[PDB]
Subunit: 474 residues, 4 copies
Amino acid sequence: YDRKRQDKAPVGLKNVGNTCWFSAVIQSLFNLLEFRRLVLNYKPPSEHRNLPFMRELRYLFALLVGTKRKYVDPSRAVEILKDAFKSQDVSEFTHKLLDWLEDAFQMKAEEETDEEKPKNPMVELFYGRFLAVGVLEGKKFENTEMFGQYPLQVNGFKDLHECLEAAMIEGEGKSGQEHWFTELPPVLTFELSRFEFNQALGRPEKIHNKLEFPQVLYLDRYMHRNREITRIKREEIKRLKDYLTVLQQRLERYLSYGSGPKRFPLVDVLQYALEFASSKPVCTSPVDSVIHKPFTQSRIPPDLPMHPAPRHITEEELSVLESCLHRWRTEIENDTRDLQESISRIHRTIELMYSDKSMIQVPYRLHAVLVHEGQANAGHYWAYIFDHRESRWMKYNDIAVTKSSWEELVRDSFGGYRNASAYCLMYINDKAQFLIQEEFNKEIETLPPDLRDFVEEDNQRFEKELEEWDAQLA
Amino acid sequence: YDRKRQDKAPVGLKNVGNTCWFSAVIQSLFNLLEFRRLVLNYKPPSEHRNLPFMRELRYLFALLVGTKRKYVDPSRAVEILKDAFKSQDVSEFTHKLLDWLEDAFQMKAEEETDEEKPKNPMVELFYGRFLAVGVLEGKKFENTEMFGQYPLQVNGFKDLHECLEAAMIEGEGKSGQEHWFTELPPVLTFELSRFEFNQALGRPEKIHNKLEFPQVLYLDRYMHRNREITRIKREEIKRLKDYLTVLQQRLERYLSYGSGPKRFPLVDVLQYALEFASSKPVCTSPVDSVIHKPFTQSRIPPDLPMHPAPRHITEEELSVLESCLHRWRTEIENDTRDLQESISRIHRTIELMYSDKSMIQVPYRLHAVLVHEGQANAGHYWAYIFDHRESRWMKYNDIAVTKSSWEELVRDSFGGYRNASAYCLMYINDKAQFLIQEEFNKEIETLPPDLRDFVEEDNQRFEKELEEWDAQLA
Amino acid sequence: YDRKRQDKAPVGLKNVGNTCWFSAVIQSLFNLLEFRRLVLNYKPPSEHRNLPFMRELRYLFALLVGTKRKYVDPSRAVEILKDAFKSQDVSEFTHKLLDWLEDAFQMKAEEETDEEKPKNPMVELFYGRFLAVGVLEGKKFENTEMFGQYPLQVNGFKDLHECLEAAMIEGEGKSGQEHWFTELPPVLTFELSRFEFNQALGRPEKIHNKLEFPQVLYLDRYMHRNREITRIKREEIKRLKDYLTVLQQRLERYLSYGSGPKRFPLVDVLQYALEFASSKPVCTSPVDSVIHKPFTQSRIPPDLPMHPAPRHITEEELSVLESCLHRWRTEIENDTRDLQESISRIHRTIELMYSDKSMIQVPYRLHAVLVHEGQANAGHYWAYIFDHRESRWMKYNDIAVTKSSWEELVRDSFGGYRNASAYCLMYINDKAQFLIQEEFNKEIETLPPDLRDFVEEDNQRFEKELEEWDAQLA
Amino acid sequence: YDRKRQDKAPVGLKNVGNTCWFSAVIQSLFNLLEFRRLVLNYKPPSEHRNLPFMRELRYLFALLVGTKRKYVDPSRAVEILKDAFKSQDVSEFTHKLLDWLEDAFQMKAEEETDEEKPKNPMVELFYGRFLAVGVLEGKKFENTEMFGQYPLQVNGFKDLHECLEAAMIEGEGKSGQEHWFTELPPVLTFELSRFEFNQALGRPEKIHNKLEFPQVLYLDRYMHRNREITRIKREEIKRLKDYLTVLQQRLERYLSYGSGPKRFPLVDVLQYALEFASSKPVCTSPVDSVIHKPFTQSRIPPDLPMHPAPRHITEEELSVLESCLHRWRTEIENDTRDLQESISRIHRTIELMYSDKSMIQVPYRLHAVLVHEGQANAGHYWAYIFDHRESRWMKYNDIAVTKSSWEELVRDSFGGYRNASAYCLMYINDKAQFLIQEEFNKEIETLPPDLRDFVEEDNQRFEKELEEWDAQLA
């Protein structure tokens, strides 16, 4: 019973009161290096639980870098935003934790207002600004606004793009609105709300559709720059979707054919008709070591007529049927093929609509995925985070930080597969490569003298416990 | 908080360590009046936990008759057979409880061996004797044996008779065995073992087939008296079952027709063929307030050709098809009918095989059903018991004895429906009407002076608690 | 090959060009006696295919009464309304056939305009008049109108009443409309349109919901007389339906419980939890003739721990769980019961809403049901008709008129069960008992001298063919 | 209407009386070059329909090589083996067609018995010899025998190897038998019999299990050479299969857990228990533009208690449950993982058992696959054949020879997917590369002078029809 790091790995967090949402959200910010620098180069500049929190955060980050031991107890910092709702959501606890930083980095960026007016390095990372072409009542309206995480809703949609286009267009002398981005943050986050009313049940629940999202997300379609072209693509998309719907309907009828309540493939009914016509006729079905030549069939049953076959049939009734059906069967076997082939193409076309230079210009690496299993109020949470340097997806589940994969991530995050599902996606701008994923070079020993001390004391303190482990063999 | 009987109802039992199997089995014996007399007319005659048990049983029966309060704590008596396995099944606990009585009623029937040799009134009720026509190895063998509850196994069978015939015949210079009853007990019990190995799983589990049993059971087929006729019926049964199997196979083919992996009703394939032939032809399906007269149809769609229809067709291709199919359809529509009708009859015949005078002569009332929900070692148990006098099925679940029904009973007991299922059936001989269901007449006050006292003391003691309930309003 | 009537049964019709809709609709009018009298007491009074049709109809009715032979060829009469669309629906063919009669009985009721103005005995039977409380635009509007068959639409509804209420109320400064009957015909017909668009498919198809209808239909709720009370019931109905919806939602959650995508009965999860807690603990599951006493169980497996069981458990962890779950299980087992019981009651209440004297006063016998299997343009049709006198449902399928049942009728007519389904219901007023189902008494030989002759000639002509059948044995 | 070859492609066959089995089997032999040489270098050497057949075969092969036109009418040759059953199977028609060749190549190999005794070049290709270690009755027996196509049966098996091992071992003082190959043909064929009795139905039908087979088949395990090692592997295989069965059983219980008839994943029951315990308590459930911060959730419902939650709960009932379940859940979540992981490994191990040098030494290219859709007597047939030179799978369906793929082939041949399924597999020895797939080099014009003439005449004759096609524009 003495378990430390392993070859200087990443360190997890023992979360304390099933408040895992913390470890999830922290580990995401911690692995975003620029923000980690910001938190370590912060001192209290000279709601005021604000500042002792960020001190203990500073202390926990320090620990997360230069501890020798497997995990840390962040409860020191948690306890702070915990009692801060006394005198009660899970997504308010965080909303405050972001206010605290937003406000606290405003405070320490106000040390150079000696010759100046404000500018906030946290708000520089997360927030951006989108324009709103709102033709809201007869007359046109055009509001540009600030935005944090863009919230997206998930019901119905297959992929993220689908899920986003539709989340940015509302309505449409007919009122209406459409968004476009003006300025993206470098650290772009999305919310995926799966909550929806369940009429069968009483109340609103998590939807469970699979919703898939890319490792690389190209945002260029969603901006004023390409406002003109996008809008033109979007028509063609719709007019195509419209088309395949007709093909899909017209296909369904081949596949699911019949006037009755149970319906079968037309292919199969024609095939099975001719089988019965071609069946050897009958009148009374209510009372009763060998060497094989190359292309032969052993075991082929005797051709004794039975079961259902027709009672009689002309030679010139048969060969009419055989002409008619065996022709039609092929008329279907192809029409089906052509309808599937027609659709595949139209799908392909829609896939590629936004796919070349000019529209492959604003790429984003998926950095972190926050996933949640369980009920609305009470869940478990955890996170997937890209290593970047080692270039591998890492799964941060409270104490335990495992090397993971995209394939694994997918099973948890997309939904449908497990009970779990993703709720925050966190993308970072590829172009802003090192504004976020740099390591300020000069040439544990990478920390301010404040923290470098504490972390080393607390190392040594934990070291003694190991001297005491092999000294406790005798 | 003071709840007594209601209009002198039946009284339940607070079972103590999820040992409900007790309340179940006791309440069954208690409601069997003759046995209840026996237990009340027993005094210790002059493994010897045997006797103080039966004293406390005597005391609990007394209570069950003449208490004024809703239930009794039988733990006094339970505790006795509980520690009796120290120095561990649930179906050994009972096996001992029956030994105790069997042995203890032998003891007090040995008070009149002054001029005599033995005879046991308990063993007179439960036990009977069956003969064994065993042609076990070349030569014939014929063993008559005593039997308690006949154990039956349940896998596969629909009804109890099926479940019993097959449980009494084993095998068949070929070895073999068959049982017949010689002497039935008046109080005939059956075990229904649902345990069987589950190859998919590891280990043996409860089967869940529905298995149904009658309110009145006629045993005459199962005896030496009718040995000759039964054996003759059993042939005809088999030779009929054999027959309907052919009808059922030959039917299946009409219903589930096709050479492929998915197969459909022949009726429907012929119907849907003619629909397609009769469909209005087409060449290019891969690229594109009113008064109503009596028998009209509004809303009948326009006849515009579409979707799948054939590319061309002669007038004399059509009317060949129409002749051929519309004929065959009717050839099937009838063959089906005749095959179903043939089967119904054969079923009927088998139902009635053992159904008239000479074979309606040994009837048994289902008296009690013991049912069990839950796993093999740990369950819940309860019982259904016929009132006889009030003539209503009563559901005895530990503390709570509710007026119930045959329909309800059926849902718990038969299996398939709920998780629960019956494991003991307890039938009583109709002819032996009052040897069991009498009430020895003379003309609470129906009990020996011993018990009449205790029960009345303990009444009064419980009465004071009620004086203390309305006296505790102030 | 000579097949005549059987004991003077009813006679069918060999329909000629899969125009069965004729035999269906005719046999319905023929069995409605008053209308049959009308057609036989019609002579051409002195679109003029009108009159030679009705002559051949007169001749076919005559035949249907007094033929000795099994069926008749009505093609003489069919041919007439057939070519009448040359110079093309199936429900126009009939619409004309009704115009012809409607107009032709107007012609022969105009023989007593010598001292008078019109009155039409056909129109007297079929047609009625309904009022329209239409609050159509701000201001109120109130139109009474004539009506033939009331057309009803079927999607969604369970029973006919449901299917009718909703068919008589449209909408609802908000526009709206509601119908009530003013004057019912004695011979009240309804259309059941099952056609609806099928978005999955291309085009509109037959719906297949089961829709049930009564043998006796009480119309009183649907009239101005009870306009006040009905409207009051309809509120209470709605406010109850509203209520049970809440009960049904709140029930669903007990039955289909879980945060995940697959959800199970809460009962079962609690039951299966306690089974696992109560399972005998284990640490390493990834690498490895007897007399039976009455209430015992043979074959109960050994209790060897295995498979999944927990790794460890306190005695005071167990009995907390056992207290908590075994309590909750019962809290659910009852809540479920109470919710089902609550619903049953509310259903009952709604069933009886319109059920006593004052609302059991306008009864209608279902006289005939017209059913149709097959596609929109091309079907098969047939009819069920109540005998009244013999008091038995008769199934008229082209040539073949069989004794049938309500149970059989139900399978064809209601939908869901077979491919077939009913499209016209024909009810008759119970009170107008003999205006329709009389037989004008005086005391084959029940026909005018015209027809009595022809029918007897044509009898004799058919008789000779039978003299020629036993004379053709030699 | 004049359609010839396309860029000198392969030529199909218009089969004549739904006798496609011919085109199938011929095109397979034709594309096997050595056999094609044999048939072209055959002249009648000097049942005697034998020889004029092979003349017309010679003529049809000639045509298949050097025709300019799209297909050929082989009916000349078919007609010959057709009437040869007059004075009636489909797999006798072929059995004769192979006898004819077998016998006819014996005849023309008997032209060099001037100094010799026999040797047959056809029989050299197809036939081989297998040994039979038969311990048939107490004493051992050892028969080596000739064999043509090895017939395999398909029920149950997944892959061909499985399907073959089991087809070569029969039984096992206990009788028994096992085969091993002694001498393989270079052109090794297998039969896949899918016919089996269908007890539910009447009679034997095609099974539809997917059965998969490789493009490259390594036969070394199936021979006397490796008799010793194979037998040793086969034990270890069995003892492993035995093992995973235990793992699979022990897994099933985690996944499909419950005492009742419906059973659910243990994971899910524990998860859903804790959800309900953790549900916010309740007493009466039978009667009643914003900027979002980064990691927040909008739309999270209010926490108002409802529906099912428990009636009450201690703080120290809760945290016992939470300890107990949240622990156990993880105990399962891992045990599952370990059991799946254990199995994957054991599967892998079995896959590789026969997989390295010494057992990768006798490789066979799948050359041709013959597939058949339809009923036992009446089917459609077609073939897939590897090009070798162009190195692409070609689908030969009567007239129409299309460029195809392994992926496509798989859909037709393996079964389960379509109605069709493969019945002959034809493998060729990789090592015997050119004994079969050579082209005897020297340096249409590749044919004897006999055939070179006819084929060119018949070319020119067909050429005139094209002069007549553009000359028939005017």
